[PDB]
Symmetry: C2
Subunit: 132 residues, 2 copies
């Protein structure tokens, strides 16, 4: 929570295509979904995703903001587990910053699309197993 | 919970070196650890690991048996998320079946070592994202 391998961890996260974000539902069960990380700044304690308001992950976060992210590199040599609190902000300014031509495709009404939901993860702990 | 891509999913799990097992701690936070799957039989609703009694994952499971497993293939083309209930049995018969020369190494007193803890995951839901 207050120390570093941050350099290499952020390196590992930029390398991995999909985070597995795990959440707990009203019955307390854990489920995960793969998602592409839009931004990772560990010094500012911020991991950002662009989600859908209709998604299960957003549904679960609305009742329980305590989430987990995990990242595995394709060489199977590096793993990261983050424990964090997920927020559901509306921030046009921020959405603009995170926007790509990928998203302009799969969101019928672009940056004004009602289904867009930014997810801000504020990590409070990070464990990792790096090689080597 | 009552249907199949079980064939290919078990195939995907045999292919992946480490599951990320996520658990929730007394404060409700989620944390994950990488672990090698000792056995996967989805028809019998059984995923087995050999853990350590001193481990955090076992600690968390003792108070909250509701866990998550995720598996990502190194080609980044296949992902599996399992929601499950973890049990902490003592079963010599079963330990014998799951035993390898790897474990004989890193457990000072072998199959009689006090630190051994079998973990049985009984899945109740599986989602996956396969290609393609």
């Amino acid at each position: 929570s207050n120390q570093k391998h941050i350099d290499k961890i952020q390196a590992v996260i930029k390398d991995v295509k999909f985070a597995m974000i795990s959440t707990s539902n009203k019955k307390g069960d854990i489920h995960a979904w793969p998602m592409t990380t839009s931004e990772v700044n560990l010094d500012n304690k911020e991991i950002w995703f662009i989600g859908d308001k209709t998604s299960d992950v957003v549904k679960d976060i609305q009742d329980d903001a305590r989430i987990g992210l995990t990242y595995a590199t394709q060489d199977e040599k590096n793993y990261v587990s983050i424990s964090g609190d997920a927020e559901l902000p509306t921030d046009k300014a921020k959405l603009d910053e995170l926007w790509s031509p990928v998203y302009s495709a799969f969101f019928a009404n672009g940056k004004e699309d009602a289904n867009i939901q930014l997810i801000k993860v504020v990590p409070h702990g990070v464990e990792c197993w790096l090689s080597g």
